[PDB]
Amino acid sequence: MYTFVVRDENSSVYAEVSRLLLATGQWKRLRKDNPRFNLMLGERNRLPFGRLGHEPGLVQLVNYYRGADKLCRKASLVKLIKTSPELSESCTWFPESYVIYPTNTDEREVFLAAYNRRREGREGNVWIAKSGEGILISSEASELLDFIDVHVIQKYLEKPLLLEPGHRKFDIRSWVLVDHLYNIYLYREGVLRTSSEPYNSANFQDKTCHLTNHCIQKENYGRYEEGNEMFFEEFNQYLMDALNTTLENSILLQIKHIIRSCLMCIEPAISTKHLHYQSFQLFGFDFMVDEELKVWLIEVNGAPACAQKLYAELCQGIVDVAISSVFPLATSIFIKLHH
Amino acid sequence: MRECISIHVGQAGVQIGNACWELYCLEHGIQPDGQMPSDKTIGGGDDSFNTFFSETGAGKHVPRAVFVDLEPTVIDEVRTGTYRQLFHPEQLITGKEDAANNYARGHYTIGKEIIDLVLDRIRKLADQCTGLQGFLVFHSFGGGTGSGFTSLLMERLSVDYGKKSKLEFSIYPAPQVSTAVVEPYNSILTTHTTLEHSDCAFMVDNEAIYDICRRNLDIERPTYTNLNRLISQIVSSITASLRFDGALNVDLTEFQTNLVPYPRIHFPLATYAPVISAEKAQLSVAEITNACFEPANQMVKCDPRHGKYMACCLLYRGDVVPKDVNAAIATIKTKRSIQFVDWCPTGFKVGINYQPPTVVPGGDLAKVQRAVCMLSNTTAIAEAWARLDHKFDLMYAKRAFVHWYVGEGMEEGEFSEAREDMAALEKDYEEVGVD
Amino acid sequence: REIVHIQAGQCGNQIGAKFWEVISDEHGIDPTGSYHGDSDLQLERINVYYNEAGNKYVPRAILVDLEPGTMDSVRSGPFGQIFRPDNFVFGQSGAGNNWAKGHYTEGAELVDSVLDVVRKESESCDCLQGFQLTHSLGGGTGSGMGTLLISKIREEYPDRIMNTFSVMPSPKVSDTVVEPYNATLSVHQLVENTDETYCIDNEALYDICFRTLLTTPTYGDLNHLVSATMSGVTTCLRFPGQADLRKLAVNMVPFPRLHFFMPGFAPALTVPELTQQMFDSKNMMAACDPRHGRYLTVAAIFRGRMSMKEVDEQMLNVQNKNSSYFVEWIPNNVKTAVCDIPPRGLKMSATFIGNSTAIQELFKRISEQFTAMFRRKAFLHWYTGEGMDEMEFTEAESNMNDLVSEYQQYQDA
Amino acid sequence: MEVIELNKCTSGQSFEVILKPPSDPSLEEIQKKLEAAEERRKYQEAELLKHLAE
Ligand SMILES: Nc1nc2c(ncn2[C@@H]2O[C@H](COP(=O)(O)OP(=O)(O)OP(=O)(O)O)[C@@H](O)[C@H]2O)c(=O)[nH]1
Ligand SMILES: Nc1ncnc2c1ncn2[C@@H]1O[C@H](COP(=O)(O)OP(=O)(O)CP(=O)(O)O)[C@@H](O)[C@H]1O
Ligand SMILES: CO[C@H]1C[C@H]2CC[C@@H](C1)N2c1c(-c2c(F)cc(F)cc2F)c(Cl)nc2ncnn12
Ligand SMILES: Nc1nc2c(ncn2[C@@H]2O[C@H](COP(=O)(O)OP(=O)(O)O)[C@@H](O)[C@H]2O)c(=O)[nH]1
Ligand SMILES: [Mg+2]
Ligand SMILES: [Mg+2]
Ligand SMILES: [Mg+2]
C-alpha cells in the first residue's frame, strides 16, 4: 500500500484528490512532516524539492514541476516568451507586452516607443496594466504609468469576440495535466467565464464589464448562463449556429498548439525524466478570442481551481493518469498532445 | 617540484586512501614493493609524480601520506595488505579505542591526546619536502574520527602551515550504507569548524556512488570496496594534474583560483563519465561530455538546472582533442539548461591527459579509451546542505542523542552555533544562485 | 575490545552458563577450553569474550551468588569446567528473596571479593570496552547484589559501558511474593547506572516455547531461548562486522534514561518470512506489545548466507508498511547488520533489538503492583529490618513513575 | 565561441573556452577550548564520584 502527505490545505483540487485516494483504501495519509511518503501534494511557495527522492526504497512523486513558475507568473511569462528561441518572438498568439518596474531589466522606454509609433498612425492605443485588485485599463500611457505607485503592461484586445445575446466578452479556461513522462494531457472539458454586462469601448472605468473573473462578475449575474459558466457543448453549438463553424476548428486547434508550444519550451528545464524524484502538475490556461476567431494566451495558472461541475471528473483524471501510473492499484477524458 | 601531503583520517578516509594509492601505483608503474622500473633517477628526481612519492636510496618510491585512525582495525589491513611494503610504519598511526561515531569524542576527548603525535608525523613528511604545496584530507562526515579529529587537525594545520593550501575529499552520509543515526550532527559540526580552514572541498555522497554502482555496474549490494574503487577513479582524475605534466591545476592553489570565487562556497560538484561494468561488452567526446550534465552521474544528487554556475572545469583522460571538446560544448550549450552568475563569464577550463584512465585488475570498472570528470561550482549542491540540516533539525528539536556530546565536554551551544553557520551558508547559496 | 561478563544469582548464573555454552560452540571451543574449529573466522574476535592460555581459551566470566547451590550446578554439567575456578565467588547465607540483604547486608560482605576478580580480569585486558551482567530483578542476589555490583563497578570504571540482560517480572506469572519490591528497587538503580538493558520476561519466553515452538517447557528451554538472543545481539561484537558497546549505545540510546530494550528472535523460512516474524509481538521476549508504542530506534542482525540486497528490501518494506510505529523525528532510526556465520542448527537467523516506548507498560505494571503493597506497607518490615528507610522506597517508586511519563512524552512527540 | 590559453605538452594539453563575457585562531585559542571541554568532563566525573561516594 502507499502513503502520501498534504502540504497545502487550501487546494480545492487536491483536497478532492486526497479523499479519493483515501477512499481507494490502498492509500494512507501520513502527517505532513512525515518524510516516508510516496506522493506529496505540496505547498505553493518554497516547496522543498531538494529533499525529495532521497529516502531509500521509496518512489517519491510530487504534484509540482520545479521551475514551472517560469510559465505561471506574469512577469516571468513575458520574459520567457521574449527571450526563448523556441518562442522566438514568433509568438503571434501572445499580446504585445512589456515588463515595467516601479521607480520605487526594465523596458518602460521601449513601451513608450511602441505606444508613440501607434499614436502617429492613429492605431488603437488601449493597454492594460497588471501584476480582482490592481488592474487599470487606459487609452493613454500617462494613466498607465501613474499606476507606478513588478508589473506587466499589455496591449488590450479592443476587438474581442462577443457572445450573443448580451454583446458580452468572455475568457476560456483549459486544464492541462503533465505527467511524470512529460506527456501533455488536455482535459476535454473547458469552461468559458463570461461577462454579464454588455461590452463598452468608450468606458474602461467600470472594470467589471471589461474583465471576466468569476470573482468580479459574481458581485446581471447568471441571467444568460448559470454562474456565468458556459461549457463546451453550448459554446460549440453557438459557434455552429452563429458563425457556421466549430469549436475544434476555429479555436481548439490554436489552444492545443499554444499549450504544446509553452510546455515543450520549458521541458528540458523542468523534466524529471532522469531525476531521483518525479513530478506531475495540473495547469490552467487562460485564453481570449477576438472577433476574427484568433486565440490569444493571457495567463498560465500553476495552482488552478476548477469549475464545480467538473471537480469530480478532473480530480479522478489526475488520480488515474498522474498518480496511479506511478503507484498502480490492486473513452479517456484527456486529449493527448503529442511531441 | 612542489610536494603534496595526503592525510587519511578514520575508516572512510583510510580505506579510500588504500584504493587511491593502489590506483596511483598502477598509473605510474610503481609496484607493491615500491620499485619503479621506468624511473631511471634513483633515490632522486624532481618529476611530477614525485609530488606524491618520495624516493629512498634503494629506489623505493614512498607515498607522501599519513594514515590515522583512533582504533587499529582498518589501518592494520594496510600494514598487512598487498601494498604493505610501500609504507613505513611511521606513516600508519592508530589509537586503541575509537570515537564511537561521536564528534565530541573525536575532537575533544581523544583529539587532544593524539593531535601532537599526528602533527609530528606530518612534520616528518614536511621535513622531506623542498617546497610544500599543502595537504589533501580524506575523511567521512559521519564518523566520530572522520568528523571530530579531522576538524581539530584542520585547525592545527592552519596554525602550523598558514601559507599552505588544504583540500578535502569528504564522504557525505547516506542511510543505505550507514550504520550511524547521529551522522547529521557530526556532519554539520565538522563542516562548521572546518569551513574557514578548507580552501576547496570535494563532497562525495555515498548515495550517489551506491546508485551508480547498482545501475551502471549491475551490482546488487555494493560494498565499500566497490564504492571506494569508483571513488578513487574520481579522486585520481582530480589529482592527476598534480602527478602528471600539465598546465591546468598543477598547484593546489589553482583549485581555489579556478573553482572558488567565494571562500565559503568552496564545494564544487563532481561528475564522472563513463562508468561501465567490466562484465558488459564506444562513447564519443560529445557523449561523455553531455553525460556530465546528467544528475545520475553526479557525485551528489542535486539539480544544477535550478542553480547557477560560478566556474566549470573539464578533466579528460585518454584520447581527446581540443576541437572535439569545443564542438561538444557548443551542441550542449544549445540543448541543456546551463546558466552562470552575471559576474562570471559563461566558460569552461579544459584539461586533457593522454593517458587513459587506469583500472584495478579484477575490478568492476571496464577500461575506457576516453573518460571525463567535470568539476563545477554550482549553487545546486546546497540541496545537500538543506537535506542534512533538516535531519539535524528533526533530532535537535527533541535534543535526541545530544547528551552523548555534552558528556564528552561539548556545550549545547556549539550545536546551535554550528547550525546557525549552516543556515548562513544556505542563504549565501541562495543569494548567489537565486533571483 | 574485551568484555567482562558477570552473572549473579540463580537465574543470572543459569542463563549465563547457557550463554557460554552457546557461544563456545560458535567459536568452536570444547568443555576443556580447547579449540576444535574448522575456521579461523571463529578466533578473529575470540579475545572479546575469552582469555588465551597456552592453547586453552578461558571465558572472561565472573560467577556470583550468595548461596553455593547454583554455582555447583554450573560446575557440574558441561561447559562447567571451562570457567576459571578462582572466578567463582559465592557466600553461604543466601538472600532470602530480599533486595536489602543482597544490596546492603549479606551482599556487602561478598562484594569486595567480586571486585578483586573483576579487577584482575580487567588488568589483563588490552583495552576493556565494558561489562555485561546477567541477572533477574525479582529475587535478592541478582537484583540486590547485582545492582550493588553495577554501582561499585561504575565507581571504579566510570568511563566504561555497562550493559545488562535483566529478567523482568511477568504480567501474570510470579513465584515470589515480594517481587514488586525487589524489581522497583532494581529498576531505580538500572535507570541511573546502565547504558543498555535488555528486558527478558519468563512468561514471554514460556509462551514462545509452549505455543510457537515443545510441550512441557522447562527452565533449560527458556534459558536456551535467552542464550540464542544473547548470542544474536553480541554477534556483531565477536565477528568481523564494524562494532563496539559504545558505538552501539550511541546509536540506540537517544535519551540516557530510556535505555531498556525489547529483544526478539527469528525463526525452511525465507528472508521475507524471517523479517515479518522478528517484528511480531509473539516473537518478543519482554511481554510488551510494540503496537502500543513507537520505536525510538531499532537494531536488526541477520546471520547466515543470504541475499543481502533482499534483506534490505524486506527491512524497508516493513517500516514503510508500519511507519506509524516509528518516530518521524529520528531519521533512519532502523538499522541492519549481517553476519555470515549462522547459529547452529539454523541456516539463517535474525535478532531484533527495539528501543520502544511500549516498554512503559512494563514499568507501569511493576509500578501498580509496587504501590498496592507499599500503600499498606505490606512485607516492608523485612526490608527496614535490614536497615533500609521507607524514603528509599518512595524514591524508587517516584523515579520509575518518572520513567513512565518520559516514555509517554516521546511516544506522543 | 573563443578559445584561449592553450598550453600544450607531451602528457596532454589545456585551454579555456568562453561562450559569453560576464556583465585564524591561535594555538592558544585552540588549547583553551580543548582544555575548557576537558574541565567540563572532569567536573561531570567529579559529580558522579561525589554522588557515588555519598
Ligand atoms: N565511501 C565510503 N564510506 C565509508 C567507508 N567507511 C565508512 N564510510 C561511511 O562513513 C561513515 C562512518 O564513518 P567512519 O569513517 O566509519 O568512522 P570513523 O571515522 O572511523 O569514526 P569512528 O569509527 O567513530 O572513530 C558512514 O556514513 C559510512 O557509510 C568507506 O570505506 N567508503
Ligand atoms: N490584453 C487583454 N485584452 C483584453 N482583456 C484582457 C487582457 N488581458 C487580460 N484581460 C482580461 O483580464 C481578466 C483577468 O486577467 P488575469 O487572468 O490576468 O487576472 P488573474 O491572473 O488575477 C486571474 P487568473 O490567474 O485565474 O487568470 C481576464 O478575464 C481577461 O478578460
Ligand atoms: C508460578 O511459578 C512459576 C515458577 C516456576 C514454578 C511454576 C512455573 C511458574 N515455574 C517454572 C517454569 C515456568 C512455567 F512453567 C510457566 C511460565 F509461564 C513461566 C515459567 F518460568 C518453567 Cl518453564 N520451568 C520451571 N522449573 C521450575 N519451575 N519452573
Ligand atoms: N529464566 C530462568 N528463570 C529462573 C531460573 N531459575 C530461577 N528463575 C526465576 O528467577 C526468579 C527469582 O530470581 P532468582 O535468581 O531465583 O533469585 P536470586 O538468586 O536471589 O537472584 C524466579 O521467578 C525464578 O522462577 C532459570 O534457570 N531460568
Ligand atoms: Mg493570477
Ligand atoms: Mg572508525
Ligand atoms: Mg534462589
Domain of B84, CATH number, reads 3.40.50.1440
Looking at the complex, report in whole angstroms how far the Cα of residue B425 sits from the nearest Cα belonging to chain D: 19
Its domain, for residue B38, covers 1-268
User: What are the CA-CA distances from residue C341 to residues B220, C28, C231, C387 (Å)?
Assistant: 21, 12, 12, 51
C387 annotated binding-site participant: no
Nearest C-alpha neighbor of B326 from the set D1, D20, D11: D1
Neighbours of chain D (3+ CB pairs under 8 A): B, C
In total, chain A counts a number of residues equal to 339
**A22 vs A3: CA distance, rounded Å:** 10
**Cell of residue A274, nine digits:** 532522469
Per-residue exposure over C348-370, b if at least 16 CB sit within 10 Å of its own CB, e if not = bbbbbbbbbbbbbbbbbbbbebb
Cell 577550548 belongs to D33
Per-residue exposure over D24-39, b if at least 16 CB sit within 10 Å of its own CB, e if not = eeeeeebeebbeebee
Can you give the CATH number for the domain in which C184 is found? 3.40.50.1440
Q: Which residues pair with D15 in a beta bridge?
A: B350
- Ligand 6 center–CA B14 separation, angstroms: 10
Neighbours of C344 (CB within 10 A): 11
Q: Which residues pair with D4 in a beta bridge?
A: D16
Closest ligand 4 atom, residue C70 Cα: 19
Cell 547454583 belongs to C70
Helix (H) or strand (E) holding A62: strand A61-62
The conformation of residue B356, written as its DSSP 8-state character, comes to: P
Q: Indicate the number of domains in chain B.
A: 3
Per-residue exposure over B299-338, b if at least 16 CB sit within 10 Å of its own CB, e if not = bbbbbbbbbbbbbbbbbbbbebebebbbebbeeeeeeebb
Q: Do chains C and A touch (3 or more CB pairs under 8 A)?
A: yes
Secondary structure of residue A259 in the 3-state scheme? helix
Strand ranges of the sheet holding C260-266, from the earlier edge strand across to the other edge: C88-90, C61-65, C2-8, C128-136, C161-168, C196-201, C260-266, C348-356, C295-304, C334-339
- Pairing relationship of beta strands A151-155 and A97-100 according to DSSP bridges: antiparallel
Cell 598502477 belongs to B26
User: What are the CA-CA distances from residue C223 to residues C203, C206, C226 (Å)?
Assistant: 12, 10, 5
Q: Do B112 and D34 make contact, defined as CB atoms within 8 angstroms?
A: yes
CB B166 within 8 A of CB B135: yes
C193 at the D interface (CB within 8 A)? no
**Cell of residue C75, nine digits:** 560446575
Q: Is A143 exposed, middle or buried (0-12, 13-18, 19+ CB in 10 A)?
A: middle
Neighbours of B156 (CB within 10 A): 20
**B403 vs C257: CA distance, rounded Å:** 11
**C122 vs A299: CA distance, rounded Å:** 78
Examine the domain organization and report whether C84 and C161 are in the same domain.
yes
Catalytic status, residue B168: no
Which of A1, A30, A57 is the closest to C316 by Cβ? Answer: A57
Catalytic residue among B254, B279, B408, B414: B254
- Name the residue at shortest CA distance from atom 25 of ligand 4: C175
**C88 vs B115: CA distance, rounded Å:** 43
Nearest C-alpha neighbor of A336 from the set A235, A246, A263: A263
Q: Which residues pair with A131 in a beta bridge?
A: none
Q: Is the peptide bond before A56 cis (omega within 30 degrees of 0)?
A: no
**Cell of residue A240, nine digits:** 455552429
**C262 vs C255: CA distance, rounded Å:** 16
CA torsion sign, B168 to B174 to B179 to B181? positive
C241 annotated binding-site participant: no
Q: Which residues pair with B351 in a beta bridge?
A: B315, D14
Under 8 Å CB-to-CB from C279, ≥6 apart: which residues?
C264, C290, C318, C322, C352
Q: Do A58 and C331 make contact, defined as CB atoms within 8 angstroms?
A: no
Q: Please count the CA atoms within 13 angstroms of the CA of B251 that sit on its side-chain side.
A: 10
User: What are the CA-CA distances from residue B36 to residues A76, A264, B1, B29 (Å)?
Assistant: 62, 57, 19, 6
Q: Is the peptide bond before B274 cis (omega within 30 degrees of 0)?
A: yes
Can you give the CATH number for the domain in which C411 is found? 1.10.287.600
CA A98, A100, A101 angle in degrees (round to 5)?
160
- Ligand 7 center–CA C176 separation, angstroms: 10
**B151 vs B158: CA distance, rounded Å:** 11
In total, chain B counts a number of residues equal to 435
* Helix residue spans in B217-271 (DSSP H): 224-243, 252-259
- Pairing relationship of beta strands A229-231 and A278-279 according to DSSP bridges: unpaired
CB C44 within 8 A of CB C101: no
Which residue, B219, B244, B268, sits at the end of a domain?
A: B268
Ligand with smallest separation from the Cα of C335: 1
Under 8 Å CB-to-CB from B351, ≥6 apart: which residues?
B241, B246, B247, B248, B249, B313, B314, B315, B316, D12, D14
CA torsion sign, C234 to C238 to C241 to C244? positive
Phi and psi at residue B65, to the nearest 5° = -140, 150
Phi and psi at residue B178, to the nearest 5° = -115, 140
**C143 vs C182: CA distance, rounded Å:** 6
Examine the domain organization and report whether B262 and B311 are in the same domain.
no
Secondary structure of residue A177 in the 3-state scheme? strand
Instruction: Spell out which residues of chain A touch residue C317, defining contact as CB-CB under 8 Å.
Output: 57
Which of B337, B382, B383 is the closest to A269 by Cβ? Answer: B337
Under 8 Å CB-to-CB from A240, ≥6 apart: which residues?
A246
Q: Which residues pair with D3 in a beta bridge?
A: D17
The conformation of residue A92, written as its DSSP 8-state character, comes to: T
**Cell of residue A114, nine digits:** 511602441
User: What are the CA-CA distances from residue C329 to residues A223, B182, B288, B392, B393 (Å)?
Assistant: 56, 12, 41, 10, 9
Q: Which residues pair with C201 in a beta bridge?
A: C168
Neighbours of chain A (3+ CB pairs under 8 A): B, C
**Domain range A64-95+159-339, CATH class:** alpha beta
CB C167 within 8 A of CB C15: yes
Examine the domain organization and report whether C248 and C261 are in the same domain.
no
Best residue among C136, C137, C165, C186 to mutate for probing ligand 4's pocket (most ligand atoms within 8 Å of CB) is: C136
**B77 vs C240: CA distance, rounded Å:** 13
Per-residue exposure over B109-121, b if at least 16 CB sit within 10 Å of its own CB, e if not = bbbbebbeebbeb
**B384 vs B389: CA distance, rounded Å:** 9
CATH architecture of the domain A96-158 equals 2-Layer Sandwich (3.30)
- Pairing relationship of beta strands C128-136 and C2-8 according to DSSP bridges: parallel
Those residues of chain B whose CB sits closer than 8 Å to some CB in chain C are: 11, 73, 96-98, 100-102, 175-176, 178-182, 184, 220-221, 391, 394-395, 397-398, 400-401, 403-404
- Pairing relationship of beta strands C88-90 and C61-65 according to DSSP bridges: parallel
**B76 vs A187: CA distance, rounded Å:** 66
- Pairing relationship of beta strands A127-130 and A151-155 according to DSSP bridges: antiparallel
First to last CA, chain B: 45
Cβ of B224 less than 6 Å from ligand 1: yes
- Name the residue at shortest CA distance from atom 7 of ligand 2: A156
Nearest C-alpha neighbor of B13 from the set B162, B239, B168, B205: B168
Examine the domain organization and report whether C323 and C375 are in the same domain.
no
Nearest C-alpha neighbor of C361 from the set C230, C226, C204: C204
Cβ of C214 less than 6 Å from ligand 3: no
Which residue, C254, C271, C305, sits at the end of a domain?
A: C254
Examine the domain organization and report whether B258 and B292 are in the same domain.
no
CATH architecture of the domain A1-63 equals 3-Layer(aba) Sandwich (3.40)
Nearest C-alpha neighbor of A185 from the set A256, A249, A234: A256
Instruction: Spell out which residues of chain B touch residue A55, defining contact as CB-CB under 8 Å.
Output: 175
**Which residue spans of chain A are classified as CATH 3.40.50.11480?**
1-63
CA torsion sign, A259 to A260 to A264 to A267? positive
Best residue among C219, C221, C223, C225 to mutate for probing ligand 3's pocket (most ligand atoms within 8 Å of CB) is: C219
Helix (H) or strand (E) holding B354: none
Q: In which region does residue B88 sit, left (phi positive, over 0), alpha (psi from -120 to 50) or beta (all else)?
A: beta
Nearest C-alpha neighbor of A167 from the set A201, A203, A216: A201
CB A17 within 8 A of CB A320: no
Ligand with smallest separation from the Cα of B9: 1
Q: Indicate the number of domains in chain C.
A: 3
Q: Do C155 and D49 make contact, defined as CB atoms within 8 angstroms?
A: yes
C69 annotated binding-site participant: no
Which of C313, C328, C331 is the closest to A57 by Cβ? Answer: C313
**C337 vs C325: CA distance, rounded Å:** 21
Q: Nearest-CA residue of chain C relative to B180?
A: C251
Q: Which residues pair with D22 in a beta bridge?
A: none
**Å resolution of this model?**
2.4
**A133 vs A123: CA distance, rounded Å:** 28
User: What are the CA-CA distances from residue B361 to residues B18, B212, B222, B226, B365 (Å)?
Assistant: 15, 20, 18, 13, 9
Q: Nearest-CA residue of chain B relative to C412?
A: B398
The conformation of residue B130, written as its DSSP 8-state character, comes to: S
Examine the domain organization and report whether B51 and B194 are in the same domain.
yes
CB B312 within 8 A of CB B274: no
Examine the domain organization and report whether C247 and C288 are in the same domain.
no
CB C318 within 8 A of CB A1: no
Closest ligand 3 atom, residue C203 Cα: 18
What technique determined this structure?
Answer: X-ray
Chain centroid to CA B373: 13
- Pairing relationship of beta strands C295-304 and C260-266 according to DSSP bridges: unpaired
Which of A33, A34, A56 is the closest to C323 by Cβ? Answer: A34
Examine the domain organization and report whether B364 and B301 are in the same domain.
yes
A67 at the B interface (CB within 8 A)? yes
Instruction: Spell out which residues of chain B touch residue C243, defining contact as CB-CB under 8 Å.
Output: 98
**Which residue spans of chain A are classified as CATH 3.30.1490.20?**
96-158
In total, chain D counts a number of residues equal to 54
Cell 519466553 belongs to C205
Examine the domain organization and report whether C93 and C238 are in the same domain.
yes
Examine the domain organization and report whether C39 and C171 are in the same domain.
yes
Neighbours of A12 (CB within 10 A): 14
Three-class SS of chain C = CEEEEEEEHHHHHHHHHHHHHHHHHHCCECCCCEECCCCCCCCCCHHHCEEECCCEEEECEEEEECCCHHHHHHHHCCCHHHCCHHHEEECCCCCCCCHHHHHCCHHHHHHHHHHHHHHHHHHCCCCEEEEEEEEECCCCHHHHHHHHHHHHHHHHCCCCEEEEEEEECCCCCCCCCCHHHHHHHHHHHHHHHCCEEEEEEHHHHHHHHHHHCCCCCCHHHHHHHHHHHHHHHCHHHHCCCCCCHHHHHHHHCCCCCCCEEEEEEECCCCHHHHHHHHCCHHHECCCCCHHHCCEEEEEEEEEECCCHHHHHHHHHHHHHHCHHHECCCCCCCEEEEEECCCCCCCCEEEEEEEEEHHHHHHHHHHHHHHHHHHCCCCCCHHHHCCCCCHHHHHHHHHHHHHHHHHHHHHHHC
Under 8 Å CB-to-CB from C195, ≥6 apart: which residues?
C130, C161, C162, C163, C245, C249, C253, C259
Examine the domain organization and report whether C259 and C405 are in the same domain.
no
Q: Do B221 and C247 make contact, defined as CB atoms within 8 angstroms?
A: no
**Cell of residue B431, nine digits:** 543569494
Its domain, for residue C395, covers 359-413
**C341 vs C329: CA distance, rounded Å:** 34
- Ligand 5 center–CA A301 separation, angstroms: 6
Examine the domain organization and report whether C105 and C2 are in the same domain.
yes
Nearest C-alpha neighbor of B300 from the set B422, B171, B189: B171
Can you give the CATH number for the domain in which B300 is found? 3.30.1330.20
Q: Which residues pair with B201 in a beta bridge?
A: B168
B38 annotated binding-site participant: no
Torsion, Cα C218 C222 C228 C234, to 10 degrees, reads -140
Neighbours of A183 (CB within 10 A): 17
Which residue, C254, C282, C313, sits at the end of a domain?
A: C254
Cβ of C11 less than 6 Å from ligand 4: yes
CB B265 within 8 A of CB B256: no
Chain centroid to CA C237: 15
Examine the domain organization and report whether C163 and C311 are in the same domain.
no
Cβ of C72 less than 6 Å from ligand 4: no
Q: Do chains D and A touch (3 or more CB pairs under 8 A)?
A: no
**Cell of residue A268, nine digits:** 528540458
Examine the domain organization and report whether B341 and B395 are in the same domain.
no
- Ligand 4 center–CA B418 separation, angstroms: 51
Under 8 Å CB-to-CB from C240, ≥6 apart: which residues?
C41, C44, C45
Q: Do chains C and D touch (3 or more CB pairs under 8 A)?
A: yes
Nearest C-alpha neighbor of B47 from the set B22, B71, B65, B30: B30
Examine the domain organization and report whether B303 and B261 are in the same domain.
no
Can you give the CATH number for the domain in which B402 is found? 1.10.287.600
Looking at the complex, report in whole angstroms how far the Cα of residue B68 sits from the nearest Cα belonging to chain D: 20
Examine the domain organization and report whether C5 and C113 are in the same domain.
yes
Looking at the complex, report in whole angstroms how far the Cα of residue C4 sits from the nearest Cα belonging to chain B: 16
**Cell of residue C375, nine digits:** 500503600
**A148 vs A145: CA distance, rounded Å:** 5
Nearest C-alpha neighbor of A269 from the set C121, C309, B337, C339: B337
Examine the domain organization and report whether C94 and C3 are in the same domain.
yes
**A287 vs A249: CA distance, rounded Å:** 16
